[PDB]
């Protein structure tokens, strides 16, 4: 295998030109798709807001069309999934992850309109879910689509185009090119064996998708946090502690999402009508909460800058944290189309700010700013529950642009993962793919 | 499939022993890298005061400039040729091979050789970088604790050897992310599966970086300021620049390989002719390090100057050509020291050059040449070493201009694409191959 290596080394990085070109095609489509999906979610959330103004006097009526508008939208999403594409329920990352292991199918003819229009309903209703879920799975399916259409042959192309799709899908969801590519090579790709995924090609796709997002969303950032203060060396130990706190909570939260999947399955038993009804109740709860306490519902991207700036009270942070754990579990574990990835950014930000608040008062000698502990905690639930810290760190970095916190961010992230491992926790997506793969033999 | 279901449920459970030892490896590599850096600076400093001692007799002054660097160079070439030949050149290909289990990690020899050998060449003012020493040293450090504590298993041998090199690149640039990314994009075995725990590599990189911060806080290797943004209608200029790097990469790649050959003739493999040749080269840099400092040294000093556009077009052309010459002369000679960093200075200069032309051709874009410098900084890395994700993330960690992430990523891929399409190969992988081929012949 020495003489084999010398041959391989000299042939290293020579991706087939066909795959490189198709990577650009896949990337472009996924971008436009993720852009259209985002524009769609916004519109529906906006129509719902105008409807509440139409009835802005009769509070009980106003509380009703709030419920109903989101309820109907949720049901349309739950139905689209249960009836035409059950594999489009939940995040969609475990499914695309399975497709790379060649253990799950990519039924793009069904999932593309199901996820797009199903997620459009759940997110548009104001449920606590994220765009990654839809965009990643859609993007993966888009990639499979061009593979079929152009009939490209080979394991490399199937694995690559499927990978650049999900990568370009995560990138367009956050305007985070680096975080998308990193997600493929740290979490998405097959973890227990070799594969032929061209990073160069995944890159090309991510570029175009990100470029597409920039044609339609320039000048405004998803999260603006401003330039925060630096972090002294003697203050680092506070971040390792915060990571540990995330480290024991990650696995706990991980059980809850899994366990709430079970408990909610009993409510409908698998029945398409009980389920869609249950989803309308859940979706209606968020649309209601989306009026009476907007920080307890929605994507949560709005409270992140507020939390970081320290404009919340300690009681509000505890309220938001507990209330969002509840509505995150209720929305994701119910099987609605929509990721859990992004709402863990809001949960982490709040939990970090909370820590920073106590840290500020306990040590005035450190001249602390609670916003530094929020930025550190933003990608911490990602590291403790999803167990992909490198992605979470680079993601938060791309979204917050506070690089002088790179050490606290990294330290808080590893503390999350280490204690997540040491307390018996498992990666959420890998534990879900396993739960699904095990049932696909349980009923045999 | 049921195998997968078993594997998924057991995913990411790195042995606690490997995790703890990763922290140890990282700490040691950090202090080592810190000590190496403090050493190099000291020697560069003494040489500078020596030139002051004789700051009147210009020909004498030009001599003790030559001599001080010549002697220092020779001490490095000798330390390598006599005790550890595998410590010559970068050291990245060597550690890369060690991960393939196709090269040995002789830490009892390489550690003092690379440390004190690199101390000489770098301290003399030769055009090389600290990555080479620090990465190889770090990998050896990682091997050392593996042996000492007698940790068994392929995972531990592969991991500890990987966190070492990662922690070594990190401490050389104050770039933790770029270090970790280097292992998972270039260093690790590229054609088969391996058991390298990313979480563990991370832990090592932390401590090493932390160590660097205990001794180097408050000052950055490269300060460039906040540059202007890049409009969408301006991106096509970055793809063009990436193409220019794309065709030059492979060419420069042949040159380093070819000059390795041409310089081997001068000494034939003889330890005396070689060390003597090294003293002439090292002496040249110490001379150039006085008469035209931009043509010698690590090059980290001209990057902010270039980016701020304080250079003329002619000076940029001068610096570029003069540094192509002194980079090949220093690295292809076999001296201990990486080629990684001196390509940052080469790419920055080439980019600024491009940006200058862009500024005058299109005043409607309201350009700033410094944006094309930042884009070009990790472009030679992408064209010649062919590790663009690392290069992009490295420059990002060193320049802190994230609003240029699209131009940087585009210029990077334009480099790798055209590097591939013009028959270029990854330098380090082409060097490890050159070495593995002489071994079985």
UniProtKB/Swiss-Prot annotation, chain A:
Domain of life: Bacteria
Keywords: Antiport, Cell inner membrane, Cell membrane, Chloride, Ion transport, Membrane, Stress response, Transmembrane, Transmembrane helix, Transport
Chain ranges passing through the membrane: 17-53, 61-84, 108-125, 132-150, 199-216, 237-265, 272-293, 314-333, 339-360, 406-422
Record InterPro entries: Cl-channel_ClcA, Cl-channel_core, ClC
Residue positions of motif Selectivity filter part_1: 90-94
Topological region Cytoplasmic: 101-107, 151-160, 186-198, 266-271, 423-444
Motif (Selectivity filter part_3): 339-343
Annotated consequence of substituting residue 429 to A: Abolishes gating, permitting continuous rapid transit of chloride ions
Residue ranges annotated as motif Selectivity filter part_2: 130-134
GO molecular function: chloride:proton antiporter activity; identical protein binding; voltage-gated chloride channel activity
Site residues, Mediates proton transfer from the outer aqueous phase to the interior of the protein: 132
Segments dipping into the membrane without crossing: 93-100, 161-173, 177-185, 371-385, 386-388, 389-400, 401-405
GO cellular component labels: plasma membrane
Effect of residue 132 to A/Q: Abolishes proton transport, but permits the transit of chloride ions. Abolishes gating, permitting continuous rapid transit of chloride ions
Main subcellular location of this protein, as a coarse class: membrane
Protein's job: Proton-coupled chloride transporter. Functions as antiport system and exchanges two chloride ions for 1 proton. Probably acts as an electrical shunt for an outwardly-directed proton pump that is linked to amino acid decarboxylation, as part of the extreme acid resistance (XAR) response.
Recorded family membership: Belongs to the chloride channel (TC 2.A.49) family. ClcA subfamily.
Protein name: H(+)/Cl(-) exchange transporter ClcA
Gene that produces this protein: clcA
Swiss-Prot record, chain B:
InterPro entries: Cl-channel_ClcA, Cl-channel_core, ClC
GO MF annotation terms: chloride:proton antiporter activity; identical protein binding; voltage-gated chloride channel activity
Transmembrane regions: 16-52, 60-83, 107-124, 131-149, 198-215, 236-264, 271-292, 313-332, 338-359, 405-421
Outcome of substituting residue 131 to A/Q: Abolishes proton transport, but permits the transit of chloride ions. Abolishes gating, permitting continuous rapid transit of chloride ions
Intramembrane residue segments, as ranges: 92-99, 160-172, 176-184, 370-384, 385-387, 388-399, 400-404
Upregulating conditions: By acid-shock conditions.
Keywords, sorted A to Z: Antiport, Cell inner membrane, Cell membrane, Chloride, Ion transport, Membrane, Stress response, Transmembrane, Transmembrane helix, Transport
Keyword Membrane: yes
Reactions catalysed according to its record: 2 chloride(in) + H(+)(out) = 2 chloride(out) + H(+)(in)
Motif Selectivity filter part_1: where in chain: 89-93
Biological process terms in GO annotation: cellular stress response to acidic pH; chloride transmembrane transport; proton transmembrane transport
Residues in compartment: Cytoplasmic: 100-106, 150-159, 185-197, 265-270
Chain ranges on the Periplasmic side, renumbered to this chain: 53-59, 216-235, 293-312, 360-369
Residue span of motif Selectivity filter part_2: 129-133
Membrane topology: Multi-pass membrane protein
HAMAP family: CLC_ClcA (MF_01128)
Quaternary structure and partners: Homodimer.
Free-text function comment from the UniProt entry: Proton-coupled chloride transporter. Functions as antiport system and exchanges two chloride ions for 1 proton. Probably acts as an electrical shunt for an outwardly-directed proton pump that is linked to amino acid decarboxylation, as part of the extreme acid resistance (XAR) response.
NCBIfam families associated with the record: PRK05277.1
Name of the protein: H(+)/Cl(-) exchange transporter ClcA
Organism from which the protein derives: Escherichia coli (strain K12)
